[PDB]
Amino acid sequence: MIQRTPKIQVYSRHPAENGKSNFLNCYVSGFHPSDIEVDLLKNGERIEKVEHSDLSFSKDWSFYLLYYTEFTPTEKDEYACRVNHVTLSQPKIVKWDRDM
């Protein structure tokens, strides 16, 4: 019974430009087992309708998903990603840095 902690990367489909529709992406990978909950945060509050890629896995058997929602960058508006998995005592929250 091997457990693996989920890797996270919160980015955008295209380089961020304030006021223009873009896509907020939270890519979770390398986790195990499959059961995992990912939320897209917009100023602390959770974004409702979010899409997620189909559960797949790479050669090492590690699972990976892509959750995304359409968003519009702004100066004040801050976005982050909440990821909870069995191996996390408390949920992880990674902030989206428009340049990473």
């Binding site: 019974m1 693996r4 295209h14 189909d54 340049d99």
Partner: protein, 277 residues
Amino acid sequence: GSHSMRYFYTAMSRPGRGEPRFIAVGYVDDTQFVRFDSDAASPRTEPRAPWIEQEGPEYWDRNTQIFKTNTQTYRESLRNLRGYYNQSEAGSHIIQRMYGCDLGPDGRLLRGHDQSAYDGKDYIALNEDLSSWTAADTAAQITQRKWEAARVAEQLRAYLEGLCVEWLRRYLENGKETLQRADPPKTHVTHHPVSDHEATLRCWALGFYPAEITLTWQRDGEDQTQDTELVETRPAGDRTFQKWAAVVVPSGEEQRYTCHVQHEGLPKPLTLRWEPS
């Protein structure tokens, strides 16, 4: 080699919540095209690529049936495995399988693939000759014994060398404009100072296909391989991928640093540098 098709099976037991869930996804190179989730509204395979959309309802129906059967075959397998390992009927367990054929320039099969796993660890794998098996632990030997007595190995060889390749060639043709046309990466170097003496030069590569790409930082020709911070190639969300390499440079030495991009969608390997705006 030149191309390949793969499927990823995932069967998990849900003690106390419901029956074993079975999910299967299909891939052709770095492109997914189908999905089956036995825990859905109406267990039926759904398309995930425009080029598979052109298939008749017949295709979807047959797939749905094959998966509705496989979904049941796995229900048993899950139980059998708990048995082998003496596990209790109160904990979750996952059987993961990945099979596929590698197309080679010869048009025919270049290598058959069939790797199965349990609870994250390796269970059994069909050897390169498409006839032998490699058991991980003893339990796998029990299954190996069955699968040999059941002549599964023979059937699989037949599938990979034949029907697998035939269907793959078809998919490549159907989605030729995508599956056979490489998308070069859109690059650029961002520069953000960390102090009044150091700044981060981040080499970007976005919207490319396939995912196979290599980009590294150098100075005067000498590699900064140890000093380069890389992110794992993440999916952009539209079938193309993103990736970047960052390195910290001493304010003043910037222009000595060059980023080197390698990707099959590029006739010649790019050599970038930062440019003040």
